[PDB]
Design a protein around this ligand. Structure first.
Ligand SMILES: NC(=[NH2+])NCCC[C@H](N)C(=O)O
Ligand SMILES: N[C@@H](CC(=O)O)C(=O)O
Ligand SMILES: [Cl-]
Ligand SMILES: [Cl-]
Ligand code: NA
Lengths: 685, 694
């Protein structure tokens, strides 16, 4: 099987990769994309807060990312006096830019293979305890500048180790954000959806000291001067235009065996899917009644239904595409290739071992994320009580330090209905008793009660009385904590998982990981020239493709670009999701599009055949000349499976049209000074 | 203001129409479509029971129409032991074909203008309504007089709101038997979810056979009747359809109103449609519940539910498309140019004022029209007990008007016709829908014409107690005896008593005024029509549909419902599979079809390993065009018309060519279902299969 898609290490583009790109239309070289010697594209593409991507678009450190990447910083700086979430935020001067605590932006200096130094493991199961040894060893040892940091990452399930030389800037200030109605237009409804019309962006500026080096916040740090910044094209995109996406994809698992994928589609995914669906249908029941609750639980209904949607997407995608079956055809060929290579002694039993360990780990795996999806994350009291549980066996200083931070849960009791909570505890704990593997169930077996009884006695329903339970010396507060029926029920299930499930889940998990690394090694050996790329691991990658529409269903085709016309079609006055700010509607009605327009219409978004995943939020999409044309912010629904199985016919990434970005910055915000700071170019003639 | 779309009188195709068709790729001619000298297409396209279209596809009377046109006939011979609704039905030889009482199929012999004869003496010698009164005498006068054969019938129809009158000589066949139908899961795949929706994957068809006496002439049913031999039948193409293929649809579109004033559209959108929508929604919700929980109740209500449901959803789409497209403003803009053209023609005395008068009367009639809608929807159509009661109400005034013998004639005829009414009547169902609809009439109807409602009816559930309208044996006893007594027996029944309070409240306090104003609006509409005909002579003006034979043409063409979204013009069986939901009410698939799909056993009906199912084109259709043939450039059958797409559900009021499409079953899928699925190859051997693209 020839692998489709690809998330490529930016330093290994020569050969196959560059040939594909130039045949896809790329004009620049591999050298322009990465180099240790001179300024390349990678110098304009930093890691954003360890979980997202951003890109430099001016020589004064102006960076662009998604609105939902900068959401937390924006929300942190907003209140009912200065409601930036709603109104947007724009710094007219650089001194008006708002500092952000715990926001870092990381640049890659150099990408360095250190697999040899890390691997003194084999010829000895008790020493990947040695490569942890060797990693720490080589980390301090590798050639680094004083103001730089070394990071060793595991590639290919542990067959390759690469050290990154990085610079971690710790002074990143909010420069600009559109109003939420623009930045998350269509919120939940349009999540994972194409056609999409969302101006999902926000801007920050990277600050440094007088030596243009990484530094903590100082009141007289200066704007960072990049080694490279991306010029912004005004010419727009067309179907079949070459696109390149550079970013920090978090995690893929493209080389899983069929048994793993079967466990996803037939057991683990359906398990979690029903759980969040329960929490959701019952949340939407009260949100359909009161509007003060609707504004309350909207951000949280969002956060949970997001993954609810992704998993449905993944299951349907995998079912529709027959991934399990394609995996099986591969495994029939794999076995043959092993046999013909004379490598049965190394690889001969890989598939048979997989099946037995995967068959066996199933009840643990399902029980595990029933605990997770009911206790740890979705039932907000059990999640509160669980947070309390994990500070219990920090064992006094470490306990109290953790507890001063745990008392600061002001913002969640604020806008929390325990009337609502009582609903989710009922439905979700019911599911756990009547659906979870009965052999690992604890204090179930029948207690349909202790439902409003727990929200009627727990010192965890309001915050002031929550403080009153955590009051007391280092001790007795524990005695007070186990007094609570709420915590006693969280403890109960947590003790059970931690002794009856975790001890043996983790064991089989290591057996399977060991198998997988041999499997990956076997595939790389037996299938050269089949476009095998390392699974994502939050490191800088390059992917490429083209502007291309797709078909989601029989007789339905989606074109690859949207327009403001399409947003006005979705416009609903006063709607929480589809309202449109007055100036934008004014701007539409007068077609006041400036240099951003295209024949009396304004481009908004477009989609591409680039292979992205979570972590690629805010990633730059450049054209063949290396100019910014788009801003990545999502994947289409039909290809949310792309971590397990990439299908080039329906996998698409969704990007904001940069013409739309600048339009919003300019004609909407009136922040033209941010644009004069940019390089506006015309690559098409 | 050049009028888009169109539904043309088939004898008038020469000139503008024919040029347009040949330009689209038509190879045949006007004389091939309609002729009195020799056979033509019209001979192969009869009216199917006066509400749908059908087409002859064999020289032994085999006709093809929609599954929902055959539906009432299918439901009528279905039961628990023989559920043809669910299982389909297939006459393996001609004697197994099922006779249908009260099913006729009408062929058009000739199309004859008789305007002069009809408007003879109505010039101004009268009083608008006794003008209509004189019109009806000329109509009856010509119908009796016009030359026809003995076995034929005349029917005079009104065109252009009364500016033109055309007589149709016809042959009405009365022995039409059921030959074939697919299971409902193929016949209405997707049911109400997919109704009025593209993409569509529905095999919407059924087959009948026309029978005649030994002179190849119309005959009431008889075991000695033989297959009718037609003057022409449509060969069926196996070479399929590609985008831009010329298509022509011939059929009997029921009603269209392309030439309404602004104020008519506003009344539709703002008050008539929302009322009727809300009323039908409550009725259907109640009915859906009982039918998803009981097949026997589903066999009872299948036909009655589908009829109601179809317009309920149509009206949602129609109101949606009229608003979205701003038809009201579009016409306002036309009307500001209309009168600018009545002054340019020096005709302000006949016209001009029209638009002002319309606004006057349309505003005035508003609360009556609404209150009327509530009465028709709640008493006449959706609540079956009130429905039967209201017929007794009318039969009451036959006695008063036409006499005791007329009473007992129409009473005994009413009783024999209530047979199948009670076969399909479920007391439990009708009372729950009664409880919901009477609530709506009281609370949401205009209060200044409300009847006994005094202000709260509370719940009178058991008026189904011992109203004798609930049961057939009951109903007969109520009407047993002489003309009086029976009339007082009826007056005592708690059911009919209730309907009486609503009925004479309507007939005395709403109906008189509504009629008065509507007559004025209609008359004004007649003149408005003539005005537009004069001041816009070469603007492709076609007569509104009026359930007469029309031709429309265009091409296989997709469309774009929304930004970045394109709908392709053809669907395939794998698209049906994508929608498959095991054991689902609407989207379950039969077992045999799933096997055929998995085997890709398509035979000569397949196209590179795929099975076409439906397609769409720019033909202008409306209700009545159900079952119309779509023919290619050479006059071969390539599709079977059966719906319109969501975006064009407005097309009776406003036609927009970029989004109005008709939906057709691909004839390759029809034959596939007849053949591979049912094993009814013998019906195929009857047809002439051709290859026009070879
Ligand atoms: N209620 C139904 N689904 N009827 C069948 C389809 C009828 C078609 N929409 C015309 O009218
Ligand atoms: N289904 C309808 C046709 C239409 O509405 O287009 C009958 O006739
Ligand atoms: Cl423009
Ligand atoms: Cl993504
Ligand atoms: Na495309």
């Amino acid at each position: 099987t020839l692998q489709q898609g690809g998330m490529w290490i930016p330093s290994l583009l020569s050969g196959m990769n560059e040939t594909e790109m130039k045949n896809l239309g790329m004009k620049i070289s591999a050298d322009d994309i990465y180099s240790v010697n001179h300024s390349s594209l990678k110098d304009a593409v930093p890691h954003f807060n360890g979980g997202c991507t951003s890109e430099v678009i001016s020589p004064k450190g102006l960076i662009l990312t998604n609105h939902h990447c900068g959401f937390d910083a924006i929300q942190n700086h907003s209140s009912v006096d200065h409601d930036y979430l709603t109104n947007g935020f724009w710094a007219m001067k650089m001194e008006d830019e708002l500092p952000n605590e715990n926001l870092v932006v990381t640049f890659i200096v150099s990408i360095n293979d250190v697999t040899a130094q890390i691997l003194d493991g084999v010829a000895s199961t008790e020493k990947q305890n040695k490569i942890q040894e060797n990693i720490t060893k080589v980390t301090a040892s590798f050639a680094k500048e004083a103001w730089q940091e070394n990071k060793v990452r595991t590639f290919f399930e542990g067959n390759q180790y690469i050290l990154f030389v990085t610079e971690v800037f710790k002074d990143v200030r909010l420069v600009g954000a559109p109003p939420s109605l623009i930045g998350k237009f269509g919120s939940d409804t349009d999540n994972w959806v194409w056609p999409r019309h969302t101006g999902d962006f926000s801007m920050f500026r990277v600050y440094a000291n007088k030596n243009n080096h990484p530094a903590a916040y100082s009141k007289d740090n200066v704007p960072y001067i990049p080694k490279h910044f991306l010029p912004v094209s005004l010419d727009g995109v067309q179907e079949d235009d070459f696109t390149m996406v550079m970013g920090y994809p978090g995690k893929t698992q493209e080389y899983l065996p069929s048994f793993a994928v079967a466990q996803i589609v037939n057991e683990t995914n359906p398990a979690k899917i029903e759980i969040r669906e329960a929490a959701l249908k019952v949340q939407d029941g009260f949100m359909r009644k009161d509007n003060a609750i609707k504004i309350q639980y909207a951000s949280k209904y969002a956060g949970v239904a997001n993954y609810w949607k992704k998993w449905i997407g993944e299951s349907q995608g995998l079912k529709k595409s027959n991934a399990i079956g394609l995996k099986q055809n591969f495994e029939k060929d794999f076995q043959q290739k092993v046999i013909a290579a004379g490598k049965q002694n190394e690889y001969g039993n890989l598939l048979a071992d997989f099946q037995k360990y995967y068959t066996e780990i199933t009840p643990y795996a399902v029980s595990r994320d029933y605990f997770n999806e009911v206790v740890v994350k979705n039932t907000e009291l059990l999640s509160l009580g669980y947070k309390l549980y994990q500070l219990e066996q920090v064992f006094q200083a470490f306990n109290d330090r953790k507890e001063n931070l745990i008392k600061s849960q002001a913002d969640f009791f604020k806008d929390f209905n325990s009337t609502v909570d009582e609903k989710v505890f009922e439905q979700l704990v019911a599911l756990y008793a009547t659906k979870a593997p009965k052999e690992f169930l604890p204090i179930s077996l029948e207690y349909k009660k202790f439902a409003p009884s727990i929200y009627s006695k727990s010192k965890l329903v309001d915050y002031a009385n929550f403080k009153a339970l955590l009051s007391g010396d280092a001790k007795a507060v524990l005695k007070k904590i186990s007094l609570d029926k709420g915590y006693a029920f969280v403890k109960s299930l947590a003790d059970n998982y931690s002794k009856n499930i975790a001890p043996r889940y983790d064991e089989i998990n290591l057996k399977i990981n060991a198998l997988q690394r041999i499997y990956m090694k076997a595939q790389l050996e037996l299938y050269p020239n089949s476009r095998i790329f390392p699974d994502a691991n939050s490191t800088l990658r390059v992917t490429y493709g083209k502007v291309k529409g797709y078909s989601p269903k029989d007789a339905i085709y989606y074109n690859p670009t949207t327009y403001l016309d399409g947003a006005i079609e979705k416009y609903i006055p006063g709607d929480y999701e589809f309202d449109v700010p007055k100036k934008l509607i004014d701007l539409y009605n007068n077609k006041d599009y400036g240099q951003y327009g295209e024949n009396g219409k304004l481009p908004v978004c477009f989609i591409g055949t680039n292979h992205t995943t979570g972590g690629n939020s805010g990633s730059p999409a450049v054209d063949a000349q290396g100019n910014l044309i788009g801003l990545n912010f999502d994947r289409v629904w039909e290809g949310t499976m792309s971590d397990i199985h990439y299908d080039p016919s329906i996998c698409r990434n969704v990007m904001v049209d940069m013409r739309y970005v600048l339009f919003i910055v300019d004609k909407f915000a009136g922040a033209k000074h941010l644009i004069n700071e940019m390089k506006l170019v015309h690559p098409k003639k």
